[PDB]
Ligand binder design. Structure first.
Ligand SMILES: COc1ccc2c(c1)C(=O)N[C@H](C(=O)NC1(C#N)CC1)Cc1ccc(c(Cl)c1)OCCCCO2
Length: 215
């Protein structure tokens, strides 16, 4: 594995979005992973629609939450692997509420076929992240609330409550660390991002790692 990766540089990362007062982090993590897997599949990097999932995902609970795996299933089983652009289906549940699903009028910006679950091991993950790009992961976010910058090495790691996106890492560093993109706008952490210690299962990060599949 490389000493450090960061798919933000490779241009696989859309800007930091805001999920608002709605429990749709599961939908951001999902979309962000599909954003990066589609880019890294050699396409124009494009912003995909989180509102699609929030309003239309019948396997999940919209603004009440969900699982990244179940979004991946619903996009395949229910939407023929199709994903609408942000542009054509903009995010509107920012202040907590859940508009009805509208299937028409939007434009497809990305397609998928399957998803995969990755091992609860950290070098393993580092090995998939660096070969494939941003990975949908779930975290204990308890210590994200008080986060203000730098490398978190004393994270509460007792329960998975939050979907986020893993975009890079760095072993050359003391301690080594992961780069994670959040959905709490660029006014939080380090312009939207948080760095946590790598190699201790910080915030239980290796527990629920997944990614969609393109082509
Ligand atoms: C289909 O709806 C479900 C079903 C089971 C759920 C969860 C949602 C769940 O608790 N999801 C977390 C979540 O939705 N967090 C919110 C935020 N921000 C809405 C509160 C975000 C989340 C939390 C934990 C997690 C995953 Cl993959 C996602 O790993 C699985 C741990 C137990 C599964 O908990």
């Amino acid at each position: 594995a490389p000493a450090a990766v960061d798919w933000r540089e490779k241009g696989a990362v859309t800007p930091v979005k805001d999920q608002g007062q709605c429990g749709s982090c599961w939908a951001f993590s999902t979309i962000g992973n599909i954003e990066g897997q589609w880019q890294v599949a050699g396409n124009p990097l494009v912003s995909l629609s989180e509102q699609m999932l929030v309003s239309c995902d019948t396997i999940d609970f919209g603004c009440g939450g969900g699982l990244m795996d179940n979004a991946f299933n619903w996009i395949v089983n229910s939407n023929g692997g199709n994903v609408f652009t942000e542009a054509s289906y903009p995010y509107v549940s920012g202040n907590g509420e859940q508009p009805q699903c509208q299937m028409n009028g939007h434009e497809i910006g990305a397609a998928i076929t399957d998803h995969v679950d990755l091992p609860q091991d950290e070098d393993a993950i580092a090995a998939y992240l660096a070969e494939n790009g941003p990975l949908a992961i779930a975290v204990d976010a308890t210590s994200f609330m008080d986060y203000n910058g730098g490398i978190l090495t004393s994270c509460t790691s007792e329960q998975l409550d939050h979907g986020v996106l893993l975009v890079g890492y760095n072993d050359a560093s003391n301690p080594p660390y992961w780069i994670i993109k959040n959905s709490w706008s660029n006014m939080w952490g380090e312009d939207g991002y948080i760095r946590i210690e790598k190699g201790t299962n910080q915030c239980l990060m290796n527990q629920a790692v997944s990614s969609a599949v393109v082509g």
